[PDB]
Every structure is written in C-alpha cells, then in structure tokens.
C-alpha cells in the first residue's frame, strides 16, 4: 500500500572533523589514505 | 473462519491488489512514451540519406 513509514527516529549528535572532501560529478566523496593513520608501525599487511 | 488469519489474509490480497492497479496505470502512463519513439522511427530516414 506504498508503505514508507518504516522508521524516523533520531538524527543524532554531530561533530566537526578534518577530513578530505572532493567533488566528482554530482557526488561529493571523501578521500582517505590508510597508511599513517591506522597502520603506522603495526607489522600487519595493508590490504 | 472469523479468526485473525482469515481477516488478515483478506488484507493480504487487497494490498496485493493495490500494487497491481498502481502497476498497470503506470504501464499506459509510460507506454505512451514508448509508442512515440515507434512513430518517430517509422519515419525519420537517416541523416546521410
């Protein structure tokens, strides 16, 4: 019966983060390099 | 049967029926746009000709 009222719940708390945002097409996309952030000196292979 | 099954099953078919009417009314609403390409490609000879 064109049911679309499945949920409308929170819109939770938000902050502000330095991230890397570009514009490709009409889709605004992140960018992130994961070498220095999470795999710094960890001796686990980067996938 | 008077139980909750026999009533809810009838509700199942009606909301099933509710989708099919919205389907085939959308069929001719878009089917008109289809036929317009077939009457424009019955005519329209190619540009080099």
From Swiss-Prot, chain B:
Subcellular locations according to the entry: Virion; Host nucleus
Signal peptide: none
Organism superkingdom: Viruses
Function per UniProt: Self-assembles to form an icosahedral capsid with a T=16 symmetry, about 200 nm in diameter, and consisting of 150 hexons and 12 pentons (total of 162 capsomers). Hexons form the edges and faces of the capsid and are each composed of six MCP molecules. In contrast, one penton is found at each of the 12 vertices. Eleven of the pentons are MCP pentamers, while the last vertex is occupied by the portal complex.
Subunit structure: Homomultimer. Makes the hexons and eleven out of twelve pentons. Interacts with triplex proteins 1/TRX1 and 2/TRX2; adjacent capsomers are linked together in groups of three by triplexes, heterotrimeric complexes composed of one molecule of TRX1 and two molecules of TRX2. Interacts with scaffold protein; this interaction allows efficient MCP transport to the host nucleus. Interacts with capsid vertex component 2/CVC2. Interacts with the small capsomere-interacting protein/SCP.
Family stated for the protein in its record: Belongs to the herpesviridae major capsid protein family.
Protein name: Major capsid protein
Organism (species): Human herpesvirus 2 (strain HG52)
Lineage: Viruses, Duplodnaviria, Heunggongvirae, Peploviricota, Herviviricetes
Residues of the full protein shown: 149 to 197 of 1374
